[PDB]
Amino acid sequence: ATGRIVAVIGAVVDVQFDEGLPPILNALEVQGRETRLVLEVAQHLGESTVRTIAMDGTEGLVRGQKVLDSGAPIKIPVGPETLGRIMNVIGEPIDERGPIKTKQFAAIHAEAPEFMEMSVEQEILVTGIKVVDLLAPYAKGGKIGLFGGAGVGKTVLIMELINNVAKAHGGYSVFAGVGERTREGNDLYHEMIESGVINLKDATSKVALVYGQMNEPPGARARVALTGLTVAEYFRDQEGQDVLLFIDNIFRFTQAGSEVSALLGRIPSAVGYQPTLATDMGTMQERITTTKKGSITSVQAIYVPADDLTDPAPATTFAHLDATTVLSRAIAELGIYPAVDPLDSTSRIMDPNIVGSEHYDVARGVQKILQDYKSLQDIIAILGMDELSEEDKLTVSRARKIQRFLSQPFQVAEVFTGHLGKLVPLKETIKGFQQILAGEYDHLPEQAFYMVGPIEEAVAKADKLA
Amino acid sequence: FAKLVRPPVQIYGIEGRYATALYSAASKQNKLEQVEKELLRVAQILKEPKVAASIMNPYVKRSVKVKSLSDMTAKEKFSPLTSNLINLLAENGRLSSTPGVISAFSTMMSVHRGEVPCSVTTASPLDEATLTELKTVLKSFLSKGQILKLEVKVDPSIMGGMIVRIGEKYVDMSAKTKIQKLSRAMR
Amino acid sequence: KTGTAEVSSILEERILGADTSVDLEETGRVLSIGDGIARVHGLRNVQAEEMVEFSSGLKGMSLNLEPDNVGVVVFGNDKLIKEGDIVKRTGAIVDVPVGEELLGRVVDALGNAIDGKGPIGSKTRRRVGLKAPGIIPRISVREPMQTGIKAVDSLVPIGRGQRELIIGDRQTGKTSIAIDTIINQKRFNDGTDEKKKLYCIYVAIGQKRSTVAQLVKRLTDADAMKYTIVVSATASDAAPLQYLAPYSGCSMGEYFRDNGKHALIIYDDLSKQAVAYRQMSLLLRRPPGREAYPGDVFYLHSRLLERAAKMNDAFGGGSLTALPVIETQAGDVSAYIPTNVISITDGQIFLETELFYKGIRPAINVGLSVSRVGSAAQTRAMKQVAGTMKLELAQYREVALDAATQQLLSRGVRLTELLKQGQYAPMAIEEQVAVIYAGVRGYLDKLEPSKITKFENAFLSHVISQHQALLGKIRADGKISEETDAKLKEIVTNFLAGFEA
Ligand SMILES: Nc1ncnc2c1ncn2[C@@H]1O[C@H](COP(=O)(O)OP(=O)(O)OP(=O)(O)O)[C@@H](O)[C@H]1O
Ligand SMILES: Nc1ncnc2c1ncn2[C@@H]1O[C@H](COP(=O)(O)OP(=O)(O)O)[C@@H](O)[C@H]1O
Ligand SMILES: [Mg+2]
């Protein structure tokens, strides 16, 4: 079947066929271009006419050009041969090392796992960061969010989780860059070569990379998160392994659907997004699950626009997560890195059965002394410190050291300040918050608790300022 | 662009845009009477169950509904500019509104000799002397050299009077002279 | 459902015979005009984003192709166009003249001279709608790009290929950072080492026309208009000419990057571009979003600032540095537009409006100014000294008769006054490293704070003369060795004995 391009409006191309109307989600091929322009059927308008969405720039299309139906959805090369390579939206090698040679091909638009395939196992994934071990612990095989504004650390943190968790992992890894800096994607490819994760001489590489960046058209950022997902479905289903799935950033999948929803002729909903906003996120996000064959451990990174957590795009992804780490800027101004909100970070496995009865009791004492300090900030700012009680000059004097003890020097931020990266075990971040909540360290200043590892370096710092 | 001649009625709508564009091409080349005799027979040859079907049926195509009409208007009588009109109505999907274009064109061509007829709505039809007297005083009112047409309707709700319209004039001598008795109340 | 081309002037061409003396393949008419775009009937072989020409002499871009008509975005004013015109098809995508033969001119956004010096003499044309380089050809930054400002070159260092924001309110000294970057390249463009040459491009969006004219004099007064291009779409120009101004400005810098040369471009400013793209969007009846902006403002500034990159050695080895300018309303760094550009560029420079009033100039907020990738690419002479001043400017900021407080409150004010700088005085790299040396090695700790602007203007004016041949080994060897710093100890302590307090 061949068709004629009838209307080109931005990044939405219209096509009229004469026989053989292709069904929805089929790919088409445009005839007469130097590169490869591939469309994607999105509607049927009647009078034997479809309406597509283009996956590259539509500069130079004449009304009457010929387009050829492929007969099937977009199929990318998948397998263990795609490890150690880079792939674009339609699965072509963009690393100038030759074609990707596999045996089988998998479509992009696949359906979700059923009800009788969901596994109900819950474990704990210890990371090494004091704030996310204690107050919101991470589960193996479940989704993980990372909320925050623009400039708080949603990528210095996600490159620390790669440095700790994914390097010592035994399974496979998949990175999918949706709408970030292209100079950052060059640095990730050039750090995994020196650290030996990707190897260009033999066949012992452990991570695949998928990339559709911020200089891409809106039709190619709205479909690249389905490509880095379909690569990580082979490593779970047809091999039976434990994978990791880092996506950054997932808001660009939502933003780039609103750019093209105006051109498709729709009535727009609230603050400016598409009407089908929560229908097509649930269709995407219910394909990243731990089923009865393997475990997908997705660590996403979500962007909050204009620091507003009531915006419909970062407030409809809260129903799809197990853990949650809300970053904030007002903590990052004081110099507390990572600037994790302690009273807004939630978790699902926080339960006295799974994590214990000793972990659960110290973690709830920390959220109690930090909430009572938050209710006195309206009075300390007006009437000063000398108007409180005597027992309430101890909630203030202890919460101002737990706040500074939730700071930690990261490993990837060695080139920022020149301090050593520190890692703590889970059994030692329980002991550090007992010897502060009890009152063992009421003879030290607050700045001695600033940017250290475990509790033993806090007393090895207060002897300096003597 | 070029200029186009204005019709003396100037109606509006999607059917008036096609009765004006034909009047701006048939007043040129002096063919305003040849199209009118053709258009009163294309109204007959559309409303046949072989041809009234598969023109409103949306599941055929655009192009094969043209070819089934490009030979139908070619073989019988027509090869004027009007064969492009049926060719243009079938391209734009406006083949359903073809009685709307035809019925608009007759009144647009009527006013070239017509008079926008009257309406006398009083009662049962009366004798001949009352009819010829109103037909020979209304001829004195037009002052345009055009033989006026007229319609008579029966409406018994008016008590003893009659209302008369001449185009857009509408004199009135009816039961509204009973409603003018509010001067006994409103004063 | 009434159709744009269902009018009687187009039905008459069809109903009176399919007319032969109308082209309808390379030329068409104009059906309507007035909201910006024009509705052009015909032109059945036009491409998308292809420049056309009107009968009045105006260029227009083919934006929106439909089965009836074409919507042409009109560059310039739309009074000159009338319904019923005839528009010709050029046959090429929107492109600008580009080459080495533009250094010294003042063009407008379409590539025509407005300085009154005749034609330009160009031979090559590049498109404005090209894509950024991918992941393979780029490489990390390694060469430093000097500024000549003592607060920027030692605290937020820049490198050849790194985006850097300049963000602040009105009248805080935004443009006067961008001017001193262009004048500081006089020392390198007039030398023999070709590997350190650097050109410049200035893009003026929405400014006044009388402020660009008083700017090209200041560059001509300092011999800086022989390696600088200026693109100009001022506030009286039409709205499509301000939208397409940084694209034509960046396509003139992409020439030098692909041919082994280094470029530099200053967009001034990207705030007034986004209020020009807002106008063309709402005049096309598009759904507004936050602050009545369109939904694709992020596509506007990301597809432009992704081009500023550094190629690898197999692609020539050139670069392209960008320095956009954003204006905030009363310190609002949490609005829609100043967060869409913080989440693109590789760092920030903050200009406070309440340090510009207290007499500190340039009013650089040292707490909120960061530069991530450009810290590893600076001179080891500067890193050996400015790595120490980074510590004391931190310890001054926590303490804002006690012990361990009146020591840091003494030194921390002598380093704040050391970082003031007069206008249009770009310093060299090796003259900075002696003045920052005296403030961090503990020599001016005894002086009064008011008599330290007098001290820097007296020490530099003499060591540039009597120790000129002994200063060159800092710039030549690129570092401070054990023989230079033992020599530098005697230059200062002999000058303080002669400097009359
Ligand atoms: N280092 C300096 N020392 C003294 N004065 C300065 C310095 N830098 C700038 N100024 C003064 O600041 C004034 C305004 O500077 P500038 O033109 O950069 O502001 P601006 O932010 O560009 O204004 P706008 O953006 O509103 O046009 C200048 O007239 C100049 O006198
Ligand atoms: N642990 C840390 N130590 C020092 N600086 C940090 C740390 N984490 C984040 N930052 C700062 O926060 C900023 C975060 O930027 P980045 O993570 O690159 O992108 P995003 O805007 O997506 O967070 C960086 O500029 C970095 O300087
Ligand atoms: Mg980031």
Ligand SMILES: [Mg+2]
């Ligand atoms: Mg200015």
